[PDB]
């Protein structure tokens, strides 16, 4: 069997973890109490899989996961909420204080006194992983914790284990929308480090998912309690292959390599088919061909990045429900047939595929309507660098006057560290230029 470790660090992750684990139960027919009256009904099946959940002789089941956010006010909601009787209570409410958007705190000063636990529960959880192991981490770039603690953590994990899949899911800081004014300092510092230990980090954004939440979901006033569910389903649509059967399954490690040409471009995007409200549950057939067009629609991308200002290095597509490979070859054919899409000359192959029979599910009280099938896309593209360009510009503008710097230094971060991380990011920016330029002879 295969297993994986879901970690949530900071606010954003945890709000997503609540969303994520809420879905998994439903997909597995498990009740909040860890029990299976559905198994009382069925009396069989491994639906409470070892992949994400453990089990006991009481009929309880426990997810393979953990969280920490240095904000007791968040977890406590969970600890008193509907799922308190589910999780292992040893959740790391260490929030004597928060990092307050300061990397130096969450990374160095007060990431101390905490991490030695975070690693330990991981081991206890790891020791039960008589299967594959690949990690799933949820953080937000720009936030103090989601960048500070995450950077510290993965560094050690690459040393405790190293030889493992360590895939992040994370919200990039938007170009315009922001809930803070020092995310840029915080983000760049992050990529200085996690670039090196990690192996992939799917990036998303709130602005786009907001826009999607408007246009197709027909929502006037969306909020966090809906975005997370879109972010959740993806993570399921990824991880399903480990759980159910499929005419064409896939491992985590397969994503590690087919999407990752060189060690330093392991930073792709994602889409889905959340284009379906209850009313427009009709008026469409929602085919394989139908959606596969939609996956590469600029609008339905999950970050603010025109593909058309760049090219596609590699893409992977994971389908669900009643989906036939024949259609996939057909729809994917047409996608190659269009010139709005520009690939490299490197990749005649271009595309990887994946299919699982197990359809999606739908959360009650939610938004997305039932659909007999669905698909996820990932893409490593040169286009993203414009987003990198926006950030490094912001960094330089204000850093020049050394604004907000004394706070980090007040926590022990040397000055030029910022410049060290900057020079790195320009290299990454150059790296994307390199790959993007066509070859000649």
């Amino acid at each position: 069997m295969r297993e994986c470790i879901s970690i949530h660090v900071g606010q954003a992750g945890v709000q997503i973890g609540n969303a994520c684990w809420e879905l998994y139960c439903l997909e597995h027919g498990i009740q909040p109490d860890g029990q299976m009256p559905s198994d009382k009904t069925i009396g069989g099946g491994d639906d409470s899989f070892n992949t994400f959940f453990s089990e006991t002789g009481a009929g309880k089941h426990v997810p393979r996961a953990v969280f920490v956010d240095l904000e007791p006010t968040v977890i406590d909601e969970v600890r008193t909420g509907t799922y308190r009787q589910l999780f292992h209570p040893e959740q790391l409410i260490t929030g004597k204080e928060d990092a307050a958007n300061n990397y130096a705190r969450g990374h160095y000063t007060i990431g101390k006194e905490i991490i030695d636990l975070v690693l330990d529960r991981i081991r206890k959880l790891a020791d039960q992983c008589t299967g594959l192991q690949g990690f799933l981490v949820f953080h937000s770039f720009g936030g103090g914790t989601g960048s500070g603690f995450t950077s510290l953590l993965m560094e050690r994990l690459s040393v405790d284990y190293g030889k493992k899949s360590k895939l992040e899911f994370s919200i990039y800081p938007a170009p315009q929308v922001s809930t803070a004014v020092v995310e840029p300092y915080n983000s760049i510092l992050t990529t200085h480090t996690t670039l090196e230990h990690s192996d992939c980090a799917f990036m998303v954004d709130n602005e786009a998912i907001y826009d999607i939440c408007r246009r197709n979901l027909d929502i006037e006033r969306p909020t966090y309690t809906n975005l997370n569910r879109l972010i959740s389903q993806i993570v399921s649509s990824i991880t399903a292959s480990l759980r159910f059967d499929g005419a064409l399954n896939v491992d985590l490690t397969e994503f590690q390599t087919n999407l990752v040409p060189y060690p330093r471009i392991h930073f792709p995007l994602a889409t889905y088919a959340p284009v379906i409200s209850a009313e427009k549950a009709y008026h469409e057939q929602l085919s394989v061909a139908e959606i596969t067009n939609a996956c590469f629609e600029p609008a339905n991308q999950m970050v603010k990045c025109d593909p058309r200002h760049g090219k596609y290095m590699a893409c992977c597509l994971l389908y669900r429900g009643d989906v036939v490979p024949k259609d996939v070859n057909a729809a994917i054919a047409t996608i190659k047939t269009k010139r709005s899409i520009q690939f490299v000359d490197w990749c005649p192959t271009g595309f990887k595929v994946g299919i699982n029979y197990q359809p999606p599910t739908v959360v009650p009280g939610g938004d997305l309507a039932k659909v007999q099938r669905a698909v996820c896309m990932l893409s490593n593209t040169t286009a993203i660098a414009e987003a990198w360009a926006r950030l490094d510009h912001k960094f330089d503008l204000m850093y020049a006057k050394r604004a907000f710097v004394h706070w980090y230094v007040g926590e022990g971060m040397e000055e030029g560290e910022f410049s060290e991380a900057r020079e790195d990011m320009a290299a990454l920016e150059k790296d994307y230029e390199e790959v993007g330029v066509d070859s000649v002879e």
């Binding site: 160095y108 050394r402 710097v405 004394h406 230094v409 007040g410 926590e411 022990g412 040397e414 000055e415 030029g416 560290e417 410049s419 060290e420």
Partner: protein, 366 residues
């Protein structure tokens, strides 16, 4: 005299530490021009300075001892002091870069500070005449966690004898320390004894980067007044000049990732980095000012800058000395240091001589 600051540089060589953990060379001196090779061998940065020395090796031209460096850098400031100009020299750079080894040096190869001091005493000996009477005083103090302490005080006997002082701003002469026990100099011997006491009591400590680190900032002030005859048939010795010399030994970044430490250690390191950052901002705005830019100078964001205001700018003939390493282990630090310095050349202040013809009519006749 709207005039610039002399910026000098000294690449010290590598050490036992690099011998144990091999760290290649990347700094290279084209006689005096500084060039640094990225370990990636993707870029060579290069920097030009008014002065250079190549202490990396003793042999190739460009080499200079403490006193060669003196007569390059600090003896001219001695000259301007006897001309009557206030003067400054301050050090910059990381830990283990010989910043003290240069300014102060040790017993066997003392620094620019003691070289200048004996040169100053004997230079007064050159004119120990009734033509001009001379009177020299000096103070010596330290900065630790933004707290000011007196190096020339024999502490009392107690568990806590690090008596703090505080700063006050004379509306005219600027900042100064209360209780600062400025004492009279008869000679360089007296200077030496004072310096020995102070450097002994300085809050310094061993660590993982060096056996003994300057964990506090040190200031060494001299002021020489010289009363000369005026050009009148009456009271002739009614002219005087003063000259204030300021020699400063700062601290290094001491990045905690290598300077793994805890408690008071990390506290001192934090305060140090904060101070040096503030200084850097001061330096930068000063450069912009020298470019003609109308700019607010946060002298007041700390103590070091506040006290050194009239030296970092103001009215004085000044200089900086930057210490840098050859080991690629700290190439980032050396580059930061070199960039600090090469920016630093661009700085100017307006330097004159402190006659202080107050209640004299001399300046008015002039």
């Amino acid at each position: 005299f709207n005039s610039q600051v002399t910026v000098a540089v000294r690449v010290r060589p590598f050490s036992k530490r690099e011998k144990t953990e091999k760290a290649s060379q990347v700094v290279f001196t084209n006689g005096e021009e500084i060039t640094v090779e990225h370990p990636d061998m993707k870029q060579v940065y290069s920097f030009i300075y008014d002065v250079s020395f190549w202490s990396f090796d003793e042999c190739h031209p460009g080499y200079a001892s403490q006193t060669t460096v003196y007569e390059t850098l600090a003896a001219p400031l001695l000259d301007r002091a006897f001309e009557g100009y206030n003067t400054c020299l301050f050090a910059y750079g990381q830990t283990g870069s010989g910043k003290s080894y240069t300014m102060m040096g040790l017993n066997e190869e003392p620094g620019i500070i003691p070289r200048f001091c004996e040169d100053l005493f004997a230079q007064i000996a050159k004119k120990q005449t009734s033509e001009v009477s001379y009177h020299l005083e000096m103070s010596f103090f330290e900065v630790y966690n933004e707290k000011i302490h007196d190096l020339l005080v024999c502490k009392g006997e107690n568990g806590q004898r690090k008596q703090p002082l505080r700063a006050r701003e004379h509306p005219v002469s600027g900042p100064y320390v209360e209780g600062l026990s400025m004492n009279v100099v008869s000679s360089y011997s007296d200077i030496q004894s004072w310096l020995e006491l102070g450097n002994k009591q300085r809050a310094t400590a061993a660590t993982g980067m060096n056996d003994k680190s300057s964990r506090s900032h040190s200031v060494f002030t001299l002021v020489m007044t010289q009363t000369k005859t005026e050009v009148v048939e009456g009271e002739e010795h009614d002219h005087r000049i003063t000259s204030r010399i300021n020699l400063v030994d700062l601290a290094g970044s001491e990045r905690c990732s290598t300077a793994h430490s805890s408690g008071q250690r990390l506290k001192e390191g934090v305060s140090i980095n904060k101070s040096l950052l503030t200084l850097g901002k001061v330096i930068s705005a000063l450069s912009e000012q020298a470019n003609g830019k109308r700019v607010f100078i946060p002298y007041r964001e700390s103590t070091l800058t506040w006290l050194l205001k009239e030296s970092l700018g103001g009215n004085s003939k000044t200089a900086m000395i930057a210490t840098v390493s050859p080991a690629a282990s700290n190439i980032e630090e050396t580059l930061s240091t070199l960039r600090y310095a090469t920016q630093a050349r661009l700085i100017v202040n307006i330097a004159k001589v402190n006659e202080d013809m107050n209640a004299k009519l001399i300046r008015e006749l002039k």
